[PDB]
Design a protein around this ligand. Structure first.
Ligand SMILES: OC[C@H]1O[C@@H](O[C@H]2[C@H](O)[C@@H](O)[C@H](O[C@H]3[C@H](O)[C@@H](O)[C@H](O[C@H]4[C@H](O)[C@@H](O)[C@H](O)O[C@@H]4CO)O[C@@H]3CO)O[C@@H]2CO)[C@H](O)[C@@H](O)[C@@H]1O
Ligand SMILES: [Ca+2]
Length: 771
């Protein structure tokens, strides 16, 4: 490895060998069908709301999130980088696809597949990833840095459907070597969203854009139709000329063929035919190729940038609504703008790299934090782009343009609900901290739903009872499903009835006040906007107190985020959330000078606090609840309200001494007596130190609950416990001794390491550790 020295990969990047097999991968632990795409994954490319593309550590473009809200894992084999190398004075060169694998059928059989093992490495520190190629048969060593411009406090470039591939080539040998790097891409119009005639009308054109000191050559892969539909638009790949490289191209090769139309050119001398051909295809798949060729002298280094863009302006959901994606604000809505996007990337990628470095450097340069923590902190952010992220710039056919751009991030793909609020309580830390204008827009979207009534009915999955879809004054579970109508039909979730949940209204209030505090305690307008909904939310939750202790009663069913685990009476979890929400509402009361609300919630608070303490404090920790069979279970998340109170600077809702004892107990039991403290915090443990078997969820570690708990321990000075707790989640996700969940962190695992719900929003809570 002579190439690593020539580039700058951070030590905290996650690493794996190109072509590495992983032996101990986990699988779903439920009996119903559940996504399991394998451990062959990588950091995604693409902006927020753009559709994302998962290029894996093996090199393949395989995890397709271009259909917003869907996850489609299939390798499009034509999509590759390939290399040609010939030593000066040799008869022939070698040509190799940089993909550790091969097609399943006979298409592209002429290409050289199966990039060998132990010949290069993949590195990721989101939004960057790298590959290095260190192959005994490639005398010139190569590396690529690939990224999209995902940049905190930037809502523009962060939306772009673009990726940059910055290549570095270095010749450590004593002879001149001729080198070519070729990008191939299938015209993927019709890959989704098109019913019939799926390749028909696809065509490819070549753009050559020359100004002084800027030459760009690109392929634009579109369709002859000018229809404005979800399926139609353009892909582009291209390259920017640098000194000492020549560009060649091929407009049209057949992907549903042996590939020799392209490969017979590339494998001769690494130079393509420069043959333009806009002839549209009918049945056959087609693709384009862009190549650079250069001679490297001994000791010489060369850098060349490629890019990929995709202008697919319309997203369609299952309920029938069609929306424009966010980036259309910057480039247009007609689906004929892929070249503009690509050019902007090729001309500005160096600025974008520095903007990324500028936001990563304060964390990376902090020598008090271990590398593993930096690995997790940055790489968990993959989900912001990969979580089916929807970001609208108008409804298709909309008359009056609106001021705001609605946003949604999925809870996950198996439970396909937008902004699942009981989950976003944990998972939304990166948005409030790094993209606060998005965070505030989402919370306003929730404010707007408080008094919505929808008397249409649904069957509650867990019991078979019919229930009302949306009750006035109850915050919704979610803002819809990508299978139905995001932002329009709320409460797509139906396993339980969210209108009787005891955590949603509380969590909503805590999120509102969190978003004011963590953006500098200045946004009174935001508190103004949300105030009526906050009062309504708390007032409705108060009505669910049935024995007048001042606290909502859990109803002996799962009526909160732990939606198969029954709570009954006053629970530590919903009880502490209630207390904190009440105290947050007092403070909003003072800021907005609503002394009536202040007095009201202050008296509710003092009564509930006294009773919470009496009912649940047992001398060592807070009991699970007052009325369940396993009421004395030690719950990892028992003091979630106080966790948030620390972040919101609300002081102590429970006594310092009791919180410390409770946290030490949780570490001693839920962490250290669960698989020797190496897998996070199990949710429920019996006081005899055996895991609570009342429900599956009690026997699960929740990744986002565990990272949040680590945050809580950290604010309370339990530094070792905090990082030891979080480390188990890191280890299971990323480490060789884990279960292979990189770039698909799940909700949960059980003691055997098998998982539930990969690609999950909750573990974004790791960012609470940076408050
Ligand atoms: O929806 C999000 C929610 O999901 C919870 O998980 C649920 C699944 O969503 C649901 O599909 C699953 O349904 C099971 C059910 O539990 C079983 O009891 C049932 O068993 C059948 C059996 O297969 C039949 O042979 C027999 O005729 O009837 C029995 C009884 O109905 O099978 C269905 C379908 O697989 O239940 C899951 C929970 O156990 C998550 O737990 C939750 O966290 C999510 O929010
Ligand atoms: Ca009560």
């Amino acid at each position: 490895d002579k190439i690593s020295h020539k580039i700058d990969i951070p030590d905290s990047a996650w690493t794996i060998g190109i072509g590495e097999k992983f032996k101990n991968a986990g699988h779903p632990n439920v009996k119903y069908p559940m996504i399991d795409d394998s451990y062959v994954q990588g950091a995604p490319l693409g902006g927020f709301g753009a559709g994302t593309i998962g290029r894996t550590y093996n090199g393949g473009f395989s995890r397709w999130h271009l259909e917003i809200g869907k996850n489609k894992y299939t390798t499009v084999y034509a999509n590759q980088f390939s290399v040609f190398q010939k030593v000066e004075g040799n008869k022939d060169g070698v040509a190799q696809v940089l993909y550790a694998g091969e097609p399943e059928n006979g298409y592209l059989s002429s290409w050289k597949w199966d990039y060998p093992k132990e010949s290069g490495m993949y590195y990721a520190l989101y939004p960057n990833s790298w590959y290095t190629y260190t192959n005994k048969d490639l005398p010139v060593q190569l590396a690529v840095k690939q990224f999209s411009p995902i940049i905190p406090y930037n809502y523009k470039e962060t939306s772009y459907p673009v990726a940059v591939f910055k290549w570095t080539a270095y010749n450590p040998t004593n002879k001149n070597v001729d080198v070519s790097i070729m990008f191939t891409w299938q015209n993927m119009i019709g890959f989704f969203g098109k019913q019939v005639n799926v390749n028909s009308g696809n065509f490819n054109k070549i753009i050559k854009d020359k100004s002084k000191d800027s030459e760009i050559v690109a392929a634009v892969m579109g369709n002859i139709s000018n229809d404005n539909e979800e399926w139609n638009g353009e892909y582009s790949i291209g390259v920017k000329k640098v000194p000492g490289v020549d560009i060649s191209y091929k407009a049209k090769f057949v992907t549903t063929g042996d590939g020799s139309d392209l490969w017979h050119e590339f494998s001769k001398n690494g130079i393509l035919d420069n043959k333009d051909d806009e002839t549209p295809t009918k049945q056959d798949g087609i693709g384009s190729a862009i190549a650079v060729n250069f001679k490297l002298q001994p000791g010489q280094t060369i850098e060349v940038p490629f890019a990929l863009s995709w202008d697919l302006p319309i997203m369609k959901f299952g309920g029938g609504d069609k929306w424009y994606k966010m980036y259309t604000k910057y480039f247009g809505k007609n689906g004929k703008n892929s070249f503009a996007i690509l050019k902007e990337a090729l001309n500005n990628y160096q600025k974008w790299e520095k903007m990324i470095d500028d936001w990563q450097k304060p964390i990376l340069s902090n020598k008090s934090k271990p590398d593993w923590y930096k690995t997790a902190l940055f790489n968990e952010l993959y989900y912001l782009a990969d979580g089916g992220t929807a970001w609208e710039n108008g409804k298709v056919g909309e008359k009056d343009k609106r001021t705001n751009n609605m946003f949604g991030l999925l809870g996950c793909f198996d439970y396909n609900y937008y902004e699942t609020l009981d989950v976003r309580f944990y998972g939304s830390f990166p948005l409030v901290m790094l993209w606060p204008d998005i965070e505030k827009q989402v919370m306003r979207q929730f404010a707007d739903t408080i008094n919505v009534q929808d008397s249409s009915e649904f069957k509650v999955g867990s019991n078979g009872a019919m229930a009302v879809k949306k009750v006035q004054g109850m915050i919704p579970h979610d803002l819809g499903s990508s299978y139905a109508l995001p932002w329009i039909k709320i409460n797509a979730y139906d396993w339980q009835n969210p209108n009787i949940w005891k955590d949603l209204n509380s969590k909503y209030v805590l999120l509102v006040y969190r978003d004011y505090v963590l953006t500098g305690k200045t946004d009174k307008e935001f508190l103004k906007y949300t105030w009526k909904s906050v009062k309504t939310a708390l007032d409705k939750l108060k009505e669910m107190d049935k024995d007048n202790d001042g606290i909502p009663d859990n109803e002996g069913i799962p009526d909160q985020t732990y939606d198969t685990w029954s709570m009954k009476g006053t629970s530590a979890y919903c009880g502490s959330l209630w207390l904190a929400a009440l105290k947050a509402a007092q403070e909003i009361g003072k800021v907005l000078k609503d002394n009536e609300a202040y007095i009201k919630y202050n008296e509710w608070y003092k009564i509930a606090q006294q009773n919470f303490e009496k009912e649940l404090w047992n001398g060592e920790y807070y009991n699970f609840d007052t009325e369940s069979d396993h009421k004395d279970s030690i719950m990892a998340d028992q003091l979630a309200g106080q966790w948030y109170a620390d972040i919101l600077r609300l002081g102590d809702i429970l006594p310092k001494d009791h919180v410390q004892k409770a946290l030490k107990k949780i570490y001693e039991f839920n962490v250290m007596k669960f698989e020797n403290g190496k897998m996070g915090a199990v949710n429920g443990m019996r006081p005899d130190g055996i895991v609570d078997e009342s429900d599956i969820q009690a026997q699960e570690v929740w990744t986002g609950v565990t990272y949040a708990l680590a945050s809580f321990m950290k604010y309370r000075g339990m530094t070792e416990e905090a990082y030891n707790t979080a480390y188990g989640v890191y280890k299971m996700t990323y480490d060789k001794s884990g279960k292979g969940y990189w770039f698909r962190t799940p909700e949960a695992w059980t003691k055997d390491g098998n998982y539930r719900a990969s690609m999950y929003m909750r573990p974004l809570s790791i960012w609470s550790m940076e408050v």
